Ligand binder design. Sequence first.
Ligand code: NDP
Ligand code: NDP
Ligand code: NDP
Ligand code: NDP
Lengths: 460, 460, 460, 460
Amino acid sequence: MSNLPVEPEFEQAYKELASTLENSTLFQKNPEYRKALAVVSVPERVIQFRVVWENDKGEVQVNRGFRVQFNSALGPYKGGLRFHPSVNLSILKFLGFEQIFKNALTGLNMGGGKGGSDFDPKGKSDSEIRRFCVAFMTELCRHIGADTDVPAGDIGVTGREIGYLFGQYRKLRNSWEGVLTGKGGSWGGSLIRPEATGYGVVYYVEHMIAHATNGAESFAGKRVAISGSGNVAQYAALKVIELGGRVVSLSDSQGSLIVKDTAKDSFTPAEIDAIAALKVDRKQIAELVTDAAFADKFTYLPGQRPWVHVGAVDVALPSATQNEVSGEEAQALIAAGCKFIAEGSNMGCTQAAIDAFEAHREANKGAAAIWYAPGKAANAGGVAVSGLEMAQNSARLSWTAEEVDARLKDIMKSCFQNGLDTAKEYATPADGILPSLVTGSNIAGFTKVAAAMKDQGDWW
Amino acid sequence: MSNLPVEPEFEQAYKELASTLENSTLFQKNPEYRKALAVVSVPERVIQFRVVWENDKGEVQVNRGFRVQFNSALGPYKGGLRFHPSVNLSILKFLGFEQIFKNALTGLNMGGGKGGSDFDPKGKSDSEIRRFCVAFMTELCRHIGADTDVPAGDIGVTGREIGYLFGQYRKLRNSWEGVLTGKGGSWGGSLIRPEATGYGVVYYVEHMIAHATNGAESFAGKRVAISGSGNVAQYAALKVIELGGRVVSLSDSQGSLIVKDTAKDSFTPAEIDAIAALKVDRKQIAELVTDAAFADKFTYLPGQRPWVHVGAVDVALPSATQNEVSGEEAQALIAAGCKFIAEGSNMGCTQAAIDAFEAHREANKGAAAIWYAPGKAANAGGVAVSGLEMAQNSARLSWTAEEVDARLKDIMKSCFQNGLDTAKEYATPADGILPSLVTGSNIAGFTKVAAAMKDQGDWW
Amino acid sequence: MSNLPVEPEFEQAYKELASTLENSTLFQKNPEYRKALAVVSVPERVIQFRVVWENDKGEVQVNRGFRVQFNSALGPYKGGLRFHPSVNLSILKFLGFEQIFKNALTGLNMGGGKGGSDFDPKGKSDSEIRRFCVAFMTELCRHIGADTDVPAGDIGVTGREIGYLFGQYRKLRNSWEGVLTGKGGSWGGSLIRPEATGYGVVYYVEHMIAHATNGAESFAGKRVAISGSGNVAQYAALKVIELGGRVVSLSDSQGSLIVKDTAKDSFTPAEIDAIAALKVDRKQIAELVTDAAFADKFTYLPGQRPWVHVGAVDVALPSATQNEVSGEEAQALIAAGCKFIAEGSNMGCTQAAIDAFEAHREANKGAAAIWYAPGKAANAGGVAVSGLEMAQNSARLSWTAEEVDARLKDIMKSCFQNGLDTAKEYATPADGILPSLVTGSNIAGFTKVAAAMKDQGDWW
Amino acid sequence: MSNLPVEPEFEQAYKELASTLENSTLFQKNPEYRKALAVVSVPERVIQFRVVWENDKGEVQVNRGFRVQFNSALGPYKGGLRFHPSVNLSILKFLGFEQIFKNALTGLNMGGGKGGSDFDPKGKSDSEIRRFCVAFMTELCRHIGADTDVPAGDIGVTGREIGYLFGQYRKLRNSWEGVLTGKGGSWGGSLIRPEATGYGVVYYVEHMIAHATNGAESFAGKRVAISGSGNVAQYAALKVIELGGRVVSLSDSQGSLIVKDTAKDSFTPAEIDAIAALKVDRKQIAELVTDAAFADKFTYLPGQRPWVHVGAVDVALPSATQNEVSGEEAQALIAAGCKFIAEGSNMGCTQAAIDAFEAHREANKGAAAIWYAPGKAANAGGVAVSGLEMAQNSARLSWTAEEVDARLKDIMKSCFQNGLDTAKEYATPADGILPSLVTGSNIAGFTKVAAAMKDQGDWW
Ligand SMILES: NC(=O)C1=CN([C@@H]2O[C@H](COP(=O)(O)OP(=O)(O)OC[C@H]3O[C@@H](n4cnc5c(N)ncnc54)[C@H](OP(=O)(O)O)[C@@H]3O)[C@@H](O)[C@H]2O)C=CC1
Ligand SMILES: NC(=O)C1=CN([C@@H]2O[C@H](COP(=O)(O)OP(=O)(O)OC[C@H]3O[C@@H](n4cnc5c(N)ncnc54)[C@H](OP(=O)(O)O)[C@@H]3O)[C@@H](O)[C@H]2O)C=CC1
Ligand SMILES: NC(=O)C1=CN([C@@H]2O[C@H](COP(=O)(O)OP(=O)(O)OC[C@H]3O[C@@H](n4cnc5c(N)ncnc54)[C@H](OP(=O)(O)O)[C@@H]3O)[C@@H](O)[C@H]2O)C=CC1
Ligand SMILES: NC(=O)C1=CN([C@@H]2O[C@H](COP(=O)(O)OP(=O)(O)OC[C@H]3O[C@@H](n4cnc5c(N)ncnc54)[C@H](OP(=O)(O)O)[C@@H]3O)[C@@H](O)[C@H]2O)C=CC1
């Protein structure tokens, strides 16, 4: 197969999943699943399209659009849109592939997909963003629909962009339906959706802490290093604070902002809100670091990730982008006494990082190990609450915040228990060693999809 | 109308419904309903189509495919698919006609339909069945849909076939929706769907027994003769046993399997499970009749139905196919002291059998009479639960087994009460005589559909 | 296959085609075509539907509607609509089946289909026919379209009905297209469409006469017996008269009208026009007995076909309906010196008639033989000009009468020559024996369809 | 733009077009066309999809499917399908990009596209090919249509595959329409389509010879080296022979077959027919090289291209695949006295080859130069005749071979004259130097598309 193009991010995701399935008893019990893996790994459909749009000076602009419709055995294709200058098919395939198995771990009927553009929102006006969304949806509309493919947000796609997208879908197709999630509260949105992914990360990590420490520890007083400062990071930070933890770092594409005293200080909600408002306006954390409220409390480090700069730390929640925790960073976290690392970001850890965490787990009993949770398990609360937004729209009713949050919590607890129990079944650890959440999550998502695919005749 | 082809099974079903309407005060109260009867009896739409498919030897095969869309006043067309070598338009018209009124009795919004093929699953491989299903759905897909027509199983169509069919529908139409029921648990199925029809038949007969005996008797200690050994028979048997009844017979297309001591012994769940596994593989009861587990406890009667061979018996549940209880067999059941017979199978009793049971009812007060219930009342539980599977898919959520079963019990109790009350209203029996469940059920289902049709301008 | 219903007309058409294929070298050269016969003989799709409509008194009326979409390898399904109280699926399957092979002999890209209703235009008002057509098209429109299936007239369906059907299609689908043929001249009709079938029958028999006599004789001076008095019979008669022949009979469903002097007299164009006027008004030939101008010239025979009552005749053109020339009638025609018989009607001759004509051909050298042409060859002018109507509509232009007629002539000549040549190739007659136009036409049409079906993967 | 994946074939085609437009006066006159080039070079739409299909052993197989819908300003997307193990997006984008401008040079209303799969027909049975085509079209069907995108053949896709594709389209979509070209003569094909591309190459080269030699020379007695042995090569060879030229070589993926006497010997039609029959069966030229008819007349060279092995030669028609004439091969042709080289294959010459030819042209007056014609000009007769097949289908009529061939000839003459005249206008050669057909063809195709795009608002 040397006709196939090299897609480094996709291949990284694929190899990690595959290696976890091989390092288990799964293919001894179900060798025929090798065929399922070969089938599932080739997307059902991919659409690519030119997007021509007009800038504020009246000039023609060209960007590339994509939608990867990876798998639909469990439900309509489901997953977000990324507007970032790095975007290409390789990246969106990694993300769509991840999405299959993440979705499967939610318990809801959602297939896996992802899409987006190499359009860069930075430096654009709101009007440019509106015209781009209009043009993007003009092509995308024909391929999506409430029972076919339901997009959502991701890097560079917020409630603002989902609004322009939805309005154009409605104009084009003359239907009002749950074709997108992350919608506005008055026009078919769900309460808890803004909060969902970062809350779910934190909720999942609570279960990790409870298990590893036998209920002795919690987030109360733990020091938590976060990276990113967007949707996932903001609400992960807010939930940590609500639970009495201390957030010692946030970051963005230009640098890290770290409290000067990491033993005892924390970001506050008010500071997070300030950062969030800069981000709505597509500005950098750097703009506020010399203000009164920040110059004395924080150190800004241009060009750096937080991980080697936070001192001793208890929990790490990378929440920005793929491959943002290197192997050297991982070793630094381990040396700083970090015991829990969960991916808010998709594929947040490099392979070297993952290998470092899992070797540590296998070498150190119980609470002495750093315990790593992959994004498909820990960050699934966003997509889960998107499924609940679809369910609301289908019912033509709106649920309460408490009702949505309660379902989110149950979904994240079940997701943790399924990864744990599946790791014990298929990859039973040595005595006193914590089960691999990555292996167990991978096997549990994969087998549910493989078996539904078999039932549906996709492979035999 | 000597241009019309002779369709014996449909004419049989039509005539029995019509005769029960005539033998009542319905047409005195509402003579205009004769117009409704003439309209409803001609199907709204029927699709017939060639199905070409490839056998494991690479050879072209040809079979006939059908979908009868009989009536859609109360909801989208709803009803299963039968793959059996007897299948033709007459058989499928009888079935779809019955389904209109059965569906009306469930209280849910389901029109009547039925379909299938003369494709014979016996002697085929799983791969053959998969290719057939693929080819069958390539044509069927354009006629069906979650709000148009929702098929399901019947003789020869199990969850395996539903899977191949659903998978092809999704591939063709690029939508994940409630287009079929009987689906797998991870991909839109409902708990209780496997159990539903047999459970419901037994639930229904519990009401019969309570009424006729003023609560003095139940299934506990009763001897129950069942025919068939497929989905309906298996779970009717299992519920009879759960209730403390004794199952003295099952049967298949080649013979009956009867306990030697029909006064005291019963099939067990383990024995039912063994037969069920054989049926999954499309093998016959004959294969196990020499096993240890079977040879000493049962007698195999090839070519014979159970009814004359079970001795004294209390309940009969024909659960295989149409016209499987003859007038002679009805007289034998009556002489053997049988006091309850309900159809698991569609049109299970011949007209002579029904005439014998109803004459016996009219001649014998109360608990001295054998009481006959028609399939449209007793066997409605399957389609009812299929409507709940549709409800669940529209909600994008899955209900618990207890939730589904509780709804099933309520539906079967209301069905029984509607038939009893309608018979008392339109066909009031002489003092001490049980009301006619067949006449009451027929009137109740027919009037609901007729009035809805009038409201919708289908007749005036 | 004792599940299959008995369909006498369809079985008759099928058997005659199959028998001519078997009585040839076709299956020695291409034995795999027996697979193509088995596949082609099962219709791709059949739609049946209830048609509820209102009569002039305001009362609900119910009739049965049908559309048999038999084969589409060579083009969109194509074929007319019959409104006659005999209509059922058998009859429409015989028609649609015949149409596959007929359309193949035209050279145009037309698949085979046929439809209609048991609705009886006799005794209905024009308003009642309008309301019927409106209701019938309400369901039929979703199954048809300019590139899908294009209906047309047949018994009981004239340009009046085509108009009501076209208007309802336009209203429902919001499209103006070649969905029907036989349309009016100002709204997409073709010149020569009314004349087409009857003219084409006569043009075809002119080639038979030319071949049988090396050009020495023609219709000039021939005595021609016609049956029926509708679209086919009228224009056949008119073209005979134009060519110098004498039309000695016409007939309807209640009797025959025969010139008193069949050796010397003929219908005139004015007479045929008066009969046509009666038939527009759904009245009978029988009325003309009261008029001395007709009574003086003709004999009216209630309940009789013409064949045994015309004395010596040269050509017979059955042009009414199926099975209107029996074996005894065929023997009478032979004895009366008839040398040419061609079907204007579909399956106009019974199998005993065909067998008599074909035996006579095989026994009698040269011009002493009676020569039989099947409807699929001789009546193909109507559907040929319908294909030209479709071509005009796709071009958005209207051709002259001369252009259309010139094409019709070339199509009928090519049709004759194909049947002649294919018979010489696959069923080569003894020296001096005319080749079988029925065998030749059947093989020619069948091989064209079977080969296209093979190319398209319908069989292998 | 380092997010964009490296697509070497696409970039090669793009750079060559772009370099020819830059090496001219085009952007001095129309600098705004730079924006058109940036727009046009990003495809309007691309679909990729998994194709799962079953082999003759009953095993699941997976391949990748594609359709590149590059540009639709001038017409519906138009271009063939390639089934070859090298296929990927890069290759199909090169081909689809080429197709835009090729189509524009035909004068017909056809946009540009291309598609296919990495499915390898070699080693597969006809049944495997049928099942693959069925599965491929199951997804492709939703994206194509007679007014949207009309595919056709290319490497690995012959009339056989177009048949299976068409049959499945018809089955899925229930329409008979000009959705594909290269169809069978009885089911909407065009005469001259098999012949079209190789005839057109030769026709175009006739014009090259006429111009360069001032009418003094022709193909009569010229020695012509051809590569490939498929559809393009076969009919190029046959037209050369018909015109009295001598074909000294053919080839396939395993080697070259060259006449032993290249001064005076030639392939014959009978030999070409033998080779063609091997190719229908997916076999290699190697199989026949030891037969009587071949061992003495020809030398078979495994692993070699013909160009350095034919001795002195007049005309080269690479007709196999992209990048099959290297720069060293080009120098060898020049040294062997070759004066005309036209691409039957798309992008047949490497850039080094093209640069060698064009430097030779610029250094050698008139008939002393080797004159190179790009595939978009010389091989356009195939797609042109596909446009005429679309026009036939839209008219619902079939043209004669003479009519189609006459249009083909006029199209190829106009295409040559447009490339010549445009090269004289925008890239005027020095005195006595032949105009660049590559530059002129590129500019003439590009400006027609750019201007239609501007008119339609695609850029401004
Ligand atoms: N939103 C959702 O529901 C879900 C998101 N995810 C994943 O969470 C992550 C963050 O998404 P989300 O918060 O929604 O996105 P946002 O756009 O709201 O925030 C992304 C953040 O990451 C930073 N960032 C993005 N790209 C890079 C890069 N290449 N290098 C360094 N920093 C970068 C941004 O910096 P800057 O502010 O400087 O632009 C920003 O702080 C992604 O991996 C996404 O796929 C996972 C589950 C659900
Ligand atoms: N499944 C459902 O939801 C519902 C089914 N029904 C009706 O219940 C009946 C049984 O259906 P189901 O259990 O689903 O089907 P299955 O195919 O699972 O079982 C059918 C049983 O009947 C036997 N059988 C079938 N045809 C004949 C025949 N012609 N002569 C003798 N025995 C025969 C079979 O024999 P063998 O095992 O030898 O093949 C098998 O034991 C039918 O009348 C059906 O329409 C009613 C309501 C709901
Ligand atoms: N129209 C077309 O383009 C073509 C028609 N055909 C065939 O030609 C035949 C005549 O069609 P067409 O002229 O269009 O139809 P019309 O309705 O115009 O004429 C039918 C004629 O046949 C008579 N007739 C109909 N049914 C019967 C019956 N069951 N017994 C006796 N006589 C009967 C009618 O009698 P009455 O007047 O008493 O009702 C009328 O004279 C049919 O077989 C048709 O399928 C063949 C090719 C093309
Ligand atoms: N068909 C059409 O209408 C048109 C085709 N083209 C172009 O013409 C060329 C030939 O197409 P066509 O004749 O239709 O295809 P065919 O599949 O009929 O023939 C292709 C030929 O090229 C050989 N070949 C293919 N791939 C390679 C390779 N990678 N290395 C060496 N030899 C190879 C094949 O060898 P083998 O026999 O060993 O398999 C075969 O002889 C292509 O470039 C195509 O895009 C251009 C215009 C129109």
